[PDB]
Amino acid sequence: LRKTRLAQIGTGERSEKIRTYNFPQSRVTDHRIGFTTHDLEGVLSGHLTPILEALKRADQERQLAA
RNA sequence: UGCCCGGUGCCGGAAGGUCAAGGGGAGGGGUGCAAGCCCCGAACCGAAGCCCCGGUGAACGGCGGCCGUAACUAUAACGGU
Ligand SMILES: [Mg+2]
Ligand SMILES: [Mg+2]
Ligand SMILES: [Mg+2]
Ligand SMILES: [Mg+2]
Ligand SMILES: [Mg+2]
Ligand SMILES: [Mg+2]
Ligand SMILES: [Mg+2]
Ligand SMILES: [Mg+2]
Ligand SMILES: [Mg+2]
Ligand SMILES: [Mg+2]
Ligand SMILES: [Mg+2]
Ligand SMILES: [Mg+2]
Ligand SMILES: [Mg+2]
Ligand SMILES: [Mg+2]
Ligand SMILES: [Mg+2]
What we know:
Peptide chain release factor 1 directs the termination of translation in response to the peptide chain termination codons UAG and UAA. The protein is an alpha+beta fold. It has helices spanning 2-8, 40-45, 49-60, and strands at 19-22, 27-30, 35-37. It has a three-stranded antiparallel sheet with strand order 1-2-3, with helices on one face.
């Protein structure tokens, strides 16, 4: 339970980031794949379905073999 | 060589409360023709001791429980009761 979190959370510093919610530019960016929407209000309201799907397609495009 | 004098001990306290013998003798009783003789007996005065008020530990002794809370988990300096 402990070592697993240190893979997920880690140091929690400004780096190590998975997603930026920069209110100035109304942007939510998943830096690990490059998908960025611009509905920072709807995303924060709970419409995270596109970000999960856009990671889902790049999730099996982690299984591209030979 | 710390904190606790509520209990026990000891020390201090001419007040107060309780308290024996004794003092007191309201008012009762027995007996006698009577004068009397004989018993009972309220209030009230009346020590120490105990009660009561303090002090006292190198006097007898005694020195808690539960719940919550911090940049990973853990822990809890902190808080509540
Ligand atoms: Mg004591
Ligand atoms: Mg005392
Ligand atoms: Mg004492
Ligand atoms: Mg006593
Ligand atoms: Mg004394
Ligand atoms: Mg008498
Ligand atoms: Mg007399
Ligand atoms: Mg008369
Ligand atoms: Mg007569
Ligand atoms: Mg006395
Ligand atoms: Mg006392
Ligand atoms: Mg001592
Ligand atoms: Mg003892
Ligand atoms: Mg004791
Ligand atoms: Mg914690």
